[PDB]
Amino acid sequence: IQRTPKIQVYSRHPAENGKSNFLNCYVSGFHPSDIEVDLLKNGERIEKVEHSDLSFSKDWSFYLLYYTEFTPTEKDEYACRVNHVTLSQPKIVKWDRDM
Template sequence: MAKAKEVALWCVLVAFCIYTVKTEKRTPSVQVFTRYPVEFGKENILQCYVDGFHPPKISVTLLKNGKKMDCQQSDLSFHSNWAFFQLFHANVTIDEKDEYAFRVEHETFSEPKIFKLEVY
């Protein structure tokens, strides 16, 4: 009986170690871009690709001139190393006076970070 308890404890310890290694925290990399080259006054698709983060809980908000806008999102997916990725997107008509950005909240950030669309 004591041997079975010892084996069970070792199994729990090994499982915990594997879980800990696979779940190290990773900071997301964020890219903001449009589907097509920007032409002011023409409809485009604004995209935010968030990659390489763990844990999977993340909040991404689209902002137009600092105000929240609706956007779509892909399913949450992961790489073989358990780093997650997700795409957020919205149809927009870009005006040269408007500022588009995505606010990203993740536990690896001390506060939400803003990633702006850079139009050249």
């Protein structure tokens, strides 16, 4: 327990209802390496979610890009659940279309 992850969710392209897109969840200044990251669709995790190889910033903290393929709809909300030895309960950050 030293540096705690956080945790930014964003899109590759503009949000278009019923049009293919990518969802990026970036994490993000943590330590140690043992992170465990899930992407939620209405509260339920996605099977096909590829990432980049885990790497560390100059300050020795780690970071990961978690990306998926998805078609945004206004009836559906996507989220990113991150769990790590630092924070007690698994932290969730919603994807905000507006911000």
